[PDB]
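[Discussion] Sanity-checking designs against the backbone

I'm trying to build intuition for which residues belong where. Below is a structure token string of 323 positions. I'd appreciate it if someone posts a full sequence so I can compare it with mine line by line.
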């Protein structure tokens, strides 16, 4: 309606609403106990298995759902139970995210900056896209942030951060021989270029992370340029030059080859070549190759090299008429 798309079925919104009750509410004190003084969480943790934390002075991170998940969860616990220590934790977390943001809008994996690939704009593990989703829900007074947790001035700051992040995403979207496509799992914070991360994470279009970036963009006012960018990304996911036809990724078969023939099924690669759009593989030696059986056993079983990534964004695009 107008230039706003529904949030019903939006993958980023679904992640956020699920995060509100990710753990038992009785785990709130254990979650709180790991928050660093800068407002971020230090690592991804399983709060159903760990003991009490002891705070700390290390860098915060958005690796593997950290910080963004905890802050949404604690905002909901505050909404439901009224204990202001949780409100205060959420305030520190939102400030952490904004403090981490580069002038260009990029969000790093770790902050304060640790050097290496963690400094890059990090789409990996839905980090930057879902962090911007959290800030956008906060900016727009959406539950669980419709309590007294934030002021009007806070929301103005968050809207600015979301706008900068959107600008970053639009500038980083990869032009493949003149055609707008999608994003690498990480890009240069200042130069917008695709970057490597770990040895086996090469410069590429990301089949895994580009879904969440498109979902975040679909939460925003659909300007002419944003509509074009989203339609381009969806068209890339829905192209026979991108998906593998009559295949699925079965991780139970990873001992030799998880990419297997299957009727009525499409598969997306985790990594595509920036220029040729060929699905590819890597390994701990940083090599680039096209036959997954050439990979070390530990990397083929220890990391997913493809999946059903496109399904959720293509179905959502169909729902809202973006095909």
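Best answer:
Here's mine. Compare freely.
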């Amino acid at each position: 309606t107008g230039r706003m798309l529904t949030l019903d079925g939006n993958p980023a919104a679904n992640w956020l609403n699920n995060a509100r009750t990710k753990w038992s509410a009785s785990r709130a004190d254990v979650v709180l106990s790991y928050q660093q003084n800068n407002g971020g969480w230090p690592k991804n943790l399983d709060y159903n298995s760990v003991g009490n934390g002891g705070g700390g002075n290390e860098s915060g991170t958005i690796d593997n759902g950290a910080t963004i998940t905890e802050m949404v969860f604690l905002a909901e616990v505050y909404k439901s139970g009224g204990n202001t220590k949780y409100r205060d934790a959420v305030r520190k977390a939102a400030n952490f995210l904004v403090n981490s943001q580069y002038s260009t809008g990029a969000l790093p994996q770790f902050y304060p900056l640790k050097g290496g690939y963690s400094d890059h704009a990090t789409f990996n593990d839905n980090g930057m896209a879902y962090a911007l989703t959290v800030l956008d829900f906060a900016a727009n007074k959406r539950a669980p942030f419709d309590t007294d947790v934030f002021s009007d001035n806070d929301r103005t700051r968050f809207k600015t951060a979301v706008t900068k992040g959107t600008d970053y995403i639009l500038k980083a979207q990869w032009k493949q021989n003149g055609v707008l496509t999608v994003w690498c799992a990480q890009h240069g914070a200042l130069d917008y270029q695709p970057k490597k991360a770990r040895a086996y994470e090469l410069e590429s279009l990301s089949g895994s992370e580009s879904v969440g970036v498109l979902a975040f963009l679909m939460t925003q006012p659909q300007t002419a340029e944003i509509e074009q960018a989203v339609r381009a990304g969806v068209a890339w996911f829905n192209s026979p030059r991108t998906y593998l036809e009559g295949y699925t990724y079965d991780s139970s078969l990873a001992a030799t080859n998880p990419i297997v023939p299957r009727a009525g099924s499409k598969m997306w690669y985790r990594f595509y070549d920036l220029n040729t759009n060929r699905g590819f593989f890597s390994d701990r030696d940083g090599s680039k190759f096209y036959d997954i059986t050439q990979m070390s056993l530990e990397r083929r079983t220890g990391y997913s090299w493809g999946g059903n990534y496109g399904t959720s964004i293509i179905n959502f695009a169909q729902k809202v008429g973006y095909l």
